[PDB]
Design a protein around this ligand. Structure first.
Ligand SMILES: Cc1ncc(COP(=O)(O)O)c(CN)c1O
Ligand SMILES: Cc1ncc(COP(=O)(O)O)c(CN)c1O
Ligand SMILES: Nc1ccccc1C(=O)C[C@H](N)C(=O)O
Ligand SMILES: Nc1ccccc1C(=O)C[C@H](N)C(=O)O
Lengths: 425, 425
């Protein structure tokens, strides 16, 4: 509601452009209009002339001479128009955000295409965080988030989590360090935001339940903080009934949601999207206008043409088949773990995503086991140390990926693991 | 020299880690090694399967099934290795920087592929600038750089410039406010860097001479500041003997150079590169790791394959052909200005790039002429105000692009402009 408290001095200082209100006038003028105003290079000089890209379960994508010129040329900072509209309509189909028809100043849903979702998150963190600011999140947490937040000088306040994600009673008891009003009231330092991966957390694989999401949202309004819903495994939930998102219940305009195409369509193309209140999305667009300028227009066109030919049906049909693939991988890694790990280790079943989080029994830090012993036997899993704000502290946990390994190679890795565990007790 | 001076506390706090020492060992291990440690999604799920991309004056680019999987997948933060090595070899050939065989901790030349050259510039600015820092540049200057620097709260000290770029007397005189020894001491705030666009300044078209470059470099050594060489029109110099770069004379390791393929190969692909002392390139790599992660690996592969097939000879031939094109546009717009505007405005012939900078004679501010009268007559040029730190001050200057317009379009636009100038005297 007071979006100004969640916007730094540097971020508030960002301005429009200005230049291109001019080349804007060209768009709606007569076809006889001559512009010498713009700063576009001549695309006729660019060496790539046409493209044809084959698709599985889909018609081939063709860029002809005119489309190629557009693919190779500057495009709008927030994204190409057809991809922004397709994406906004998708958010409406999926989450029907309460906020879609609110006035702009009151946090009307806006959305921008980012160069990967991580771009959206980084700009968001940069938009918000003054050193000494308090932020909430559940460890274990995505190491990219922790590495992004560290140089910002926030105090990270760990919220307790279990098989079902953040524990709302833990959140409650952290927040009683303040009362609300506190928040309407600066410089106390009531938390600016709570960040979480609600579906298939990296590294734990745990997902928030809907009931718990409702409790967290209630806390968020009470202490007036932002929720940043970083949801890159949103389209990889193994339950075919997707749990309601924070964005679907954002009646206040206090959620910022990052979505990713990195797990489902392409990670290397660097295309994600950020959804949230208009005045906050506007600040990230201005920062991108001075940094990446825009996401690859070629890559947006490839995605947008794919998405439009599929329709929301072809899109959903595709996420379904990939979930089916990851769910079989999940089953196979669970079967390997049950087989070899013994009463040797404990793990929860991943509710989404692509990682298994394994607690090794009777070993207080697993870095030697993995960095030294397992590497020598040609088997790599990831120690848990990376997923904590304090990475120097001992961790008995291992992250194991199930995205790619065959059943045979999971069987070998887990028998080797079990042996070294037993050799180390 | 002392790189820590030019690195923020946020920037200095960034960490490399904490995961991909695991990808490290996998590469240089046996083929029989099994990894579950990485966070790569399965590329087989991605819907694009092959690409065929035609090239003018070139052999067609083919991404078969295996190369496409690579193109759709995460890749290293600093760029794909074949593009980095091609680009570093280019810099050696073009600029032969003194710094190439220095120890890393001293200025060893390094290079980072960025998501456009403006991404690298923006992270350099972010890496260096504390609010209140002094920084040096010539006005008029690129609007995007002015819009990037403003929110960082630095003090921009304008350095005088003429037809031949920044005037070293003006720079020398500005620096006499300090003694050279004051650089050794943070609190009295000697400038952190000099920023300039040495070839075809946007909006002016003027280029630095080789002799002024040497004097400017002498000054930078004397008062120990960095030079940031933003050189996107480096490959668009009309004089076909290219003036020596700051990078080419950089015996101290104090130059950061931004190059762009935006004007010559593709703006919409968002691929540029940043060349500079290893310690500072390293700080920008780490900021990229938490923001974009890496430039699109698809678009890097397109460019790398084009470049490798062309070789250094094919690349420079292409740059010759595009130069010849922009040179002919320059001639056509100069001819139109001479035709219509003689006695009514003054301009220098552009030495590189794509802009003509026109000072109109009897009019103190060109905003009404351009924003109101010219618009109504259907011709757009860009008012000069946008290229100054204080955009609110009157400007009698106009920027006209010659990248695209036909000679007839230029004729009619300058005929209209001339008439409106005379109606406004
Ligand atoms: C929790 C989380 N958030 C964000 C990202 C980065 O996603 P993107 O590729 O869309 O930038 C990842 C990638 N592992 C992630 O696991
Ligand atoms: C002087 C200058 N610097 C930087 C840029 C941005 O270039 P890039 O597309 O490589 O990000 C431009 C764009 N014309 C420019 O004129
Ligand atoms: N950033 C852009 C986005 C779109 C189109 C052009 C540009 C530019 O590079 C700025 C141009 N040189 C200008 O000064 O109008
Ligand atoms: N942050 C990265 C940097 C480089 C390459 C990939 C990534 C990731 O996508 C994170 C990965 N899934 C991980 O948690 O290890």
């Amino acid at each position: 509601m007071n979006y100004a408290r969640f916007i730094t001095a540097a971020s508030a200082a960002r301005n429009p452009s200005p230049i291109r209100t001019m080349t804007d006038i060209l768009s709606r003028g007569p076809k006889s209009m001559i512009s010498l105003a713009g700063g576009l290079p001549n695309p006729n000089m660019f060496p790539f002339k046409t493209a044809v890209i084959t698709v599985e379960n889909g018609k081939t994508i063709q860029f002809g001479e005119e489309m190629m010129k557009r693919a190779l040329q500057y495009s709008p900072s927030a994204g190409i128009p057809e991809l922004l509209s397709w994406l906004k309509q998708l958010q409406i189909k999926l989450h029907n955000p309460p906020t879609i028809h609110y006035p702009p100043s009151q946090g009307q849903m806006d959305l921008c295409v980012t160069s990967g979702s991580q771009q959206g998150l980084c700009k968001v963190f940069e938009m918000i965080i003054n050193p000494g600011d308090n932020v909430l999140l559940d460890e274990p947490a995505y190491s990219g988030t922790l590495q992004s937040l560290h140089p910002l000088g926030c105090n990270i306040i760990n919220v307790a989590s279990d098989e079902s994600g953040i524990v709302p009673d833990s959140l409650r008891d952290i927040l009683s360090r303040w009362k609300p009003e506190d928040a309407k009231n600066p410089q106390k330092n009531t938390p600016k935001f709570l960040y979480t991966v609600p579906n298939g957390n990296n590294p734990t694989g745990n997902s928030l339940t809907s009931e718990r999401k409702k409790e967290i949202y209630e806390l968020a309004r009470k202490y007036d903080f932002l929720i940043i819903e970083d949801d890159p495994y949103y389209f990889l939930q193994f339950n075919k009934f997707r749990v309601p998102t924070f964005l679907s219940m954002d009646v206040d305009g206090r959620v910022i949601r990052a979505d990713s195409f990195s797990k489902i369509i392409s990670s290397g193309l660097r295309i994600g999207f950020l959804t949230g209140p208009k005045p906050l999305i506007e600040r990230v667009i201005l920062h991108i206008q001075v940094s990446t300028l825009h996401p690859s227009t070629f890559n947006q066109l490839m995605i947008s043409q794919l998405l439009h030919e599929w329709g929301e049906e072809g899109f959903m049909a595709h996420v379904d088949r990939v979930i089916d693939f990851y769910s079989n991988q999940k089953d196979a890694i669970l079967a390997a773990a049950d087989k070899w790990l013994t009463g040797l280790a404990e793990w929860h079943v991943p509710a989404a995503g692509m990682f298994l989080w394994i607690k090794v029994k009777g070993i207080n830090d697993v870095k030697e086991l993995i960095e030294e012993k397992a590497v020598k036997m040609g088997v790599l899993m990831l120690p848990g140390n990376a997923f904590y704000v304090d990475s120097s502290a001992p961790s008995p946990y291992l992250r194991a990926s199930f995205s790619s390994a065959s059943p045979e190679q999971m069987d070998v890795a887990f028998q080797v693991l079990a042996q070294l565990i037993k050799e180390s007790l």
